[PDB]
Amino acid sequence: ISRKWEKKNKIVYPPQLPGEPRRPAEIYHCRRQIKYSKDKMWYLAKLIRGMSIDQALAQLEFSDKKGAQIIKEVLLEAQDMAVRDHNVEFRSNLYVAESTSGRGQYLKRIRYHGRGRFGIMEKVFCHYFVKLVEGPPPPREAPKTAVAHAREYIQELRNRTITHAL
Amino acid sequence: AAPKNRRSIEVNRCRRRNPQKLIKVKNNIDVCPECGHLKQKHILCGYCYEKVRKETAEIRRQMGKQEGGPFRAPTTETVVLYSGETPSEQDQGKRIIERERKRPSWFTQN
Amino acid sequence: HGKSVTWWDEHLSEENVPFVKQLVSDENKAQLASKLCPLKDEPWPI
Amino acid sequence: SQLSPTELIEMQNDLFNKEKNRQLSLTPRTEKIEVKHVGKTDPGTVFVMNKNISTPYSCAMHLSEWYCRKSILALVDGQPWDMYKPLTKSCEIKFLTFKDDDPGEVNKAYWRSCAMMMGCVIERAFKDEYVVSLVRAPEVPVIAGAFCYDVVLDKRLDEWMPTKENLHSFTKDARALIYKDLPFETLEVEAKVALEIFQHNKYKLDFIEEKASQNPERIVKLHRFGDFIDVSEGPLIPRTSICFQYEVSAVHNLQTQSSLVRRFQGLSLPVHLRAHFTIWNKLLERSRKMVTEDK
Amino acid sequence: ISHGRVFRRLGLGPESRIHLLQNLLTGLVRHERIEASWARVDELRGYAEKLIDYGKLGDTNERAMRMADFWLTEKDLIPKLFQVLAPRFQGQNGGYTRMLQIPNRNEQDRAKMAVIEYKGNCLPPLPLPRRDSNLTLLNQLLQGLRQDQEASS
Amino acid sequence: SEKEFVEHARKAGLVIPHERLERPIHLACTAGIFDAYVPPEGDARISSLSK
Amino acid sequence: NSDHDRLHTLVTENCFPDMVWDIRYKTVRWSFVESLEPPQVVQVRCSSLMNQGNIYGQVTVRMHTRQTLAIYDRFGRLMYGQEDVPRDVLEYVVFEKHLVDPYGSWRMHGKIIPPWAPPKQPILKTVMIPGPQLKPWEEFEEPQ
Amino acid sequence: KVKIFNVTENAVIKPGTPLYAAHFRPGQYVDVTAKTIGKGFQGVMRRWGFKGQPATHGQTKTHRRPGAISTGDVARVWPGTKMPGQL
RNA sequence: CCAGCCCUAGAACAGGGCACA
Ligand SMILES: [Mg+2]
Ligand SMILES: [Mg+2]
Ligand SMILES: [Mg+2]
Ligand SMILES: [Mg+2]
Ligand SMILES: [Mg+2]
Ligand SMILES: [Mg+2]
Ligand SMILES: [Mg+2]
Ligand SMILES: [Mg+2]
Ligand SMILES: [Mg+2]
Ligand SMILES: [Mg+2]
Ligand SMILES: [Zn+2]
């Protein structure tokens, strides 16, 4: 197996020089061997990507999925860790920077079919990884406007060269 | 029918990452002005409803302990009073349940 | 800015809902009665 | 005096920042205050805050984002308190939103903030060759359909009144001002420094003197968002983006014995309490009328 | 095509749906407040209103008596229906029940759940959704409009 | 088909394996302080003068 | 310097955890600038246990020291105090030594702080103290 | 409901005018346009009036199917193929 | 504008209504 999301939380940075902007705190947390499915957990992980922690908890409280409670507990433990261990005041000043889900070790069973046939049934397990960064959530990217489209097209036209001409 | 070829990860992602399959965000979430917990604008508050449900379960437990039988239902109205309360002139003649707990702030005397 | 969904009855009070209803009703009645005589205000050439 | 409007705004902001730096340096050390939370939701909560640095907005940030989004005003144990005002001593805080049972204080604060924003729009939506002097913001109740602001224009401007196009341009400027998030900053200063802050508006000087005469310490409250500074009573809302709907309803010229004043009346509704289109039109038609409340 | 259908299919058929609604009505008459699925409670509300009307029809009415005998499975609730529920619903016309959607069931099915309650019961009042006060900004503006309209007449 | 998981980390020590240790625990120090010195409240004012 | 070996040789097993546990994930910048009052031996005690025949001699020494302490965060930001302020501290270090041991090095055992000592310097950040997390069937009780 | 009517240039009326049923007189022929009664996703027998297979003479799970939909040589089905859908 | 609630609209999503009463 591999356990690096946990050790990602033990790196220490050198002290900051007077004048350098304050580095935002990054908190890595994870839950291993969840009975939920990998893709069904990826859906809930994608739901709460880039959102504030309070908004993510508000969405997960009313999500009807089973992994919603697991992700909510993981987010709450990550907030508690960020407040206690790391020097992070304003416990509501965290946003979900990274939120993905990986697979775990499966359990192989037999699924009977009929006429003496069977199938390989896989009891699936998943991991949920989350990363909380101190600060306001980054603004959502807006779709490209017509002015930007026209600018990019004009620049593409201006970048042309006479090919195989020299 | 059997599949003719293996579907690639590209088409698989295009299928199961379409916004039709993504979880939609809910915009009807608000806070409860009483306890501060989260609730939907069209649904009762879970915390307050749990409080009321626990109080109702206790009241029903006591009112069922009062009636030693399964088919013994009162033919008159019922009134629940808490510690330090007395039945009024309008509440007399009804069945009386007495709770040792003090009257909650949300339960109105009426 | 996560703006929430709103309708016309969310922020109204127990006393302003009937007032709003009757106000819109009287406005609609007046507007429908104003157009009852179309041939005397400014009709187009027949 | 030979002073450009941009130079006047620059010097006003410079003296404001100097007074703010003096207020900050008045406290050399970092004292810890213990502020309780007497709200109905989470009682018994205690915040160990910094003296003259931490704010009720910082308390709300410690609590939850829902508090920062909903709570507009704060009640520090005896009186309303805006979110971006640093706390002074150990106290107890109660947060106040728009949908409270007695939201009168928040209504007054929102009315004052809307009046201040409208005055900021009017002061800068006019020609530089003309003189424009804001008198004050008449404290009208919320039952009145509009918030009013008193202006005095150049002498050669007393014959014309703004048309619907001009009112729409004022509304567009106010919406553009709302678009950019500008927090309302407060400052407890003295009349001595407020006089040199303004130094040009005789009406503003008279208002500052009248507000300082009723105070035994001669302390007046200045408010500033972006580059606009104004004197007003009571606290304000934390941000401008709280104002969702905003319209400049009308202007009314009142001619007195000494001079005439243009009362600009406008209407606004928050993001939390935005109304339907027809309701907004009815309220706007009511606000188009005259509002006369001074004492 | 289910145009103009008013009853939803429940249980193992029409008779099973009738029996389910009958059990729910018996429980509602007994406890004055129950909680079930949203669809079953929405189907039961009309039967509860009609049962209160049949109870208001009187004790000596043989039709109402046999209707109560059929519906109320526990036979100790018929005197209750005729001497507690019907007498206390006299000035009212159709406002006998109150149905409110409660959060989804905490079980794995996550069923949409409602709570039905006979008005005027001896139970803690549910957290009913109260409208905003007249002291709100918008409500005060509408009050000013109303006062102007009153003064204009 | 019949397979299970392993490595369920649990910490459970009992008095029997605690006392059946072949060699005692060698301690290079004690637990805490036996006789704590309670200083007089006038140290802040007597530290101002040397003699 | 995070020299756990020499730290174990200097301080004892009761002094090591209390000074390494809450700091193993932080950066320290500690220095020694001045000392107004020389250290003074206050009292000397000895604990003799006859079950093994072992004697531990503890010596309390009062120190008036002038130190500069700056505890940084695991991300590099200042947490506790500045690295240039020479704060004055008064402590009572209790050293201990096993007298039966042939080597018997002098090791710092405990750190007594008087109860009337001035409170420590305030932290740079703010703290929220949560109230009692209430169950639905429980009501808040305001203490006065 | 908001509809558009193609009129001549001499039969134009001012916008905002009311229109009444006496616009039509007893004895006249009219055209009536409306959205018909929607029966949802209906089968081929109710949508196109196709005949089904016999009821019980051996047929297995086909009593309402459309049957053959195209020809073997075309190796595809034509766009004008009658198939179940909205009705 | 679309939270919710009805529908002669609908597999889901969509679509029409929710002031007279
Ligand atoms: Mg077999
Ligand atoms: Mg498989
Ligand atoms: Mg396979
Ligand atoms: Mg249909
Ligand atoms: Mg046939
Ligand atoms: Mg066959
Ligand atoms: Mg068959
Ligand atoms: Mg067969
Ligand atoms: Mg072909
Ligand atoms: Mg619609
Ligand atoms: Zn609640």
Output the DSSP codes for D19-50.
HHHHHHHH--S--EEEEEE--SSSTTEEEEEE
**Nearest residue to nucleotide I17 when comparing alpha carbons to its C1'?**
H1
- Least Cα distance to B76 among E80, E53, E52, E76 occurs for E80
Three-state secondary structure string covering chain A: CCCCCCHHHCCCCCCCCCCCCCCCCEEEEEEEEECCCHHHHHHHHHHCCCCEHHHHHHHHHHCCCCHHHHHHHHHHHHHHHHHHCCCCCCCCCEEEEEEEEEECCCEEEEEEEECCEEEEEEECCEEEEEEEEECCCCCCCCCCCHHHHHHHHHHHHHCCCCCCCC
- Write down the experimental method used for this entry: cryo-EM
- Cβ-Cβ contacts under 8 Å, H40 against chain E: 1
Classify residue A116 as exposed, middle or buried by CB count within 10 Å of its CB (0-12, 13-18, 19+): exposed
Q: Give the nearest partner residue to A110 out of F1, F4, F5, using CB atoms.
A: F1
Phi-psi sector, G76: left (phi>0), alpha (psi -120 to 50), beta: left
Q: Which residues surround ligand 9, an ion (CB under 5 A)?
A: H 75
- Cβ-Cβ contacts under 8 Å, G130 against chain B: none
Return the residue matching tokens 């000035």. Answer: E91
The three-class DSSP label of residue D71 is coil
The CATH number of the domain holding residue A30 is 3.90.470.10
Count CA within 13 A, CB hemisphere, residue G133. 0
C-alpha to C-alpha distance for D74 and D81, rounded to whole angstroms:
5
Residue H23 is given by DSSP the state G
The string of DSSP codes covering B46-108 is: HHHHHHHHHHHHHHHHHHHHHS-STT---SS-EEEEETT----TTTTTSEEEEESSPPPSSS-
Residue E84 is given by DSSP the state I
- G47 to F30: CB separation less than 8 angstroms, yes or no: yes
Token pair, residue D275, equals: 């109304």
Angle between the C16-34 and D277-287 helix axes, to the nearest 10 degrees?
80
- A90 to D65: CB separation less than 8 angstroms, yes or no: no
C-alpha to C-alpha distance for A140 and A51, rounded to whole angstroms:
10
- Least Cα distance to D12 among D242, D248, D196, D207 occurs for D196
Question: Which strands, in side-by-side order, build the sheet including A126-134?
Answer: A26-34, A126-134, A94-103
C-alpha to C-alpha distance for D138 and G99, rounded to whole angstroms:
86
- H14 to C42: CB separation less than 8 angstroms, yes or no: yes
Phi, psi of F33 (to 5 degrees): -110, 135
Enumerate residues 6+ apart whose C-beta is below 8 A from G30: G67, G68, G69, G70
CB B41 within 8 A of CB B30: yes
C-alpha to C-alpha distance for D175 and D121, rounded to whole angstroms:
10
- Least Cα distance to F43 among G88, G43, G114, G38 occurs for G114
Phi, psi of D62 (to 5 degrees): -65, -35
**Nearest residue to nucleotide I11 when comparing alpha carbons to its C1'?**
H41
CB C44 within 8 A of CB H14: yes
Provide the CA H79 to C1' I15 distance, Å, integer. Answer: 26
Does residue B27 approach strand I to less than 7 Å at its CB?
yes
Does residue E101 approach strand I to less than 7 Å at its CB?
yes
Does residue H46 approach strand I to less than 7 Å at its CB?
no
**Chain C interface test: which of B38, B40, B41, B42 (most C C-beta within 10 Å):** B41
Contact D45/G at CB under 8 A: yes
Buried (b) or exposed (e) across A5-17, using 16+ Cβ within 10 A? beeebeeeeebbe
C-alpha to C-alpha distance for B44 and E126, rounded to whole angstroms:
9
Provide the CA B28 to C1' I4 distance, Å, integer. Answer: 10
| Signed CA dihedral, D151, D154, D156, D162: sign only | negative
C-alpha to C-alpha distance for G66 and G140, rounded to whole angstroms:
47
The three-class DSSP label of residue G66 is strand
C-alpha to C-alpha distance for B96 and B87, rounded to whole angstroms:
8
Token pair, residue E120, equals: 């005027």
Which resolution, in Å, applies to this structure?
3.0
Enumerate residues 6+ apart whose C-beta is below 8 A from G7: G16, G20
Token pair, residue B103, equals: 């009257």
Q: Among all strands, which nt has the closest C1' to B20 (CA)?
A: I13
C-alpha to C-alpha distance for D143 and E135, rounded to whole angstroms:
10
| Signed CA dihedral, E34, E38, E40, E42: sign only | positive
* β-strands G87-98, G107-112 pairing: antiparallel
Annotated binding-site residue numbers of H for Mg(2+): 38, 63
| Signed CA dihedral, C6, C7, C10, C12: sign only | positive
Q: Among all strands, which nt has the closest C1' to H86 (CA)?
A: I10
Give the other-Cβ count within 10 Å of A127's Cβ.
Answer: 18
- Least Cα distance to D251 among D241, D238, D265 occurs for D265
Enumerate residues 6+ apart whose C-beta is below 8 A from D261: D135, D150, D151, D152, D253, D254
The three-class DSSP label of residue H87 is coil
**Centroid of ligand 3 to alpha carbon of A106 (angstroms):** 14
Classify residue G36 as exposed, middle or buried by CB count within 10 Å of its CB (0-12, 13-18, 19+): exposed
Give the other-Cβ count within 10 Å of G9's Cβ.
Answer: 11
Phi, psi of A29 (to 5 degrees): -145, 155
Give the other-Cβ count within 10 Å of A31's Cβ.
Answer: 21
Segment holding D67, helix H or strand E:
helix D65-70
C-alpha to C-alpha distance for D143 and A68, rounded to whole angstroms:
46
C-alpha to C-alpha distance for E22 and F46, rounded to whole angstroms:
90
Enumerate residues 6+ apart whose C-beta is below 8 A from G115: none
CB D270 within 8 A of CB D100: no
Phi, psi of G100 (to 5 degrees): -70, -25
Angle between the E137-151 and D277-287 helix axes, to the nearest 10 degrees?
60
- D47 to G142: CB separation less than 8 angstroms, yes or no: no
- Cβ-Cβ contacts under 8 Å, D94 against chain G: none
F/B touch flag: 3 or more CB pairs below 8 Å: no
Contact E136/C at CB under 8 A: yes
C-alpha to C-alpha distance for H74 and B27, rounded to whole angstroms:
52
C-alpha to C-alpha distance for D161 and D149, rounded to whole angstroms:
15
- Cβ-Cβ contacts under 8 Å, B29 against chain C: 4
Token pair, residue D131, equals: 């003189």
- Domains: count for chain A: 1
**Centroid of ligand 6 to alpha carbon of H83 (angstroms):** 26
* β-strands D73-76, D80-82 pairing: antiparallel
| Beta partners for residue D188, in sequence order | D221
Segment holding D134, helix H or strand E:
strand D132-136
Residue D216 is given by DSSP the state T
- G109 to F35: CB separation less than 8 angstroms, yes or no: no
CA distances from residue D89 to D26, D52, D76, E6 in whole angstroms, order as listed: 15, 8, 10, 66
- Least Cα distance to A85 among G23, D124, G98 occurs for G23
Instruction: Provide the domain limits for residue A4.
Output: 1-166
The three-class DSSP label of residue E137 is helix
CB G14 within 8 A of CB F32: yes
Phi, psi of E65 (to 5 degrees): -65, -50
| Beta partners for residue E59, in sequence order | none
Angle between the D191-198 and D5-26 helix axes, to the nearest 10 degrees?
160
Chain I positions under 7 Å from a protein CB? 1-11, 19-20
| Amino acid (one-letter) located at C16 | N
Give the other-Cβ count within 10 Å of A77's Cβ.
Answer: 13
Q: Among all strands, which nt has the closest C1' to E42 (CA)?
A: I5
Enumerate residues 6+ apart whose C-beta is below 8 A from D254: D260, D261, D263
C-alpha to C-alpha distance for G38 and G86, rounded to whole angstroms:
17
Token pair, residue E63, equals: 């039709």
- Cβ-Cβ contacts under 8 Å, G75 against chain A: 13, 23-26, 86-87
Three-state secondary structure string covering E87-119: HHCCCCCCCCEEEEEECCCCCCCCCCEEEEEEC
C-alpha to C-alpha distance for F39 and G94, rounded to whole angstroms:
13
Give the other-Cβ count within 10 Å of C8's Cβ.
Answer: 14
Cα nearest neighbour of B32 on chain D = D41
Classify residue E10 as exposed, middle or buried by CB count within 10 Å of its CB (0-12, 13-18, 19+): middle
CB A47 within 8 A of CB B23: yes
Query: Could you tell me the domains of chain E?
Result: 10-121 (3.90.1030.10)
Alpha helix ranges (H) inside D133-246? 164-179, 191-198, 202-213
- Least Cα distance to A54 among A35, A72, A31 occurs for A72
Q: Among all strands, which nt has the closest C1' to C17 (CA)?
A: I19
Classify residue F24 as exposed, middle or buried by CB count within 10 Å of its CB (0-12, 13-18, 19+): exposed
Give the other-Cβ count within 10 Å of G8's Cβ.
Answer: 14
- Least Cα distance to D147 among D110, D104, D115 occurs for D115
C-alpha to C-alpha distance for E52 and E96, rounded to whole angstroms:
7
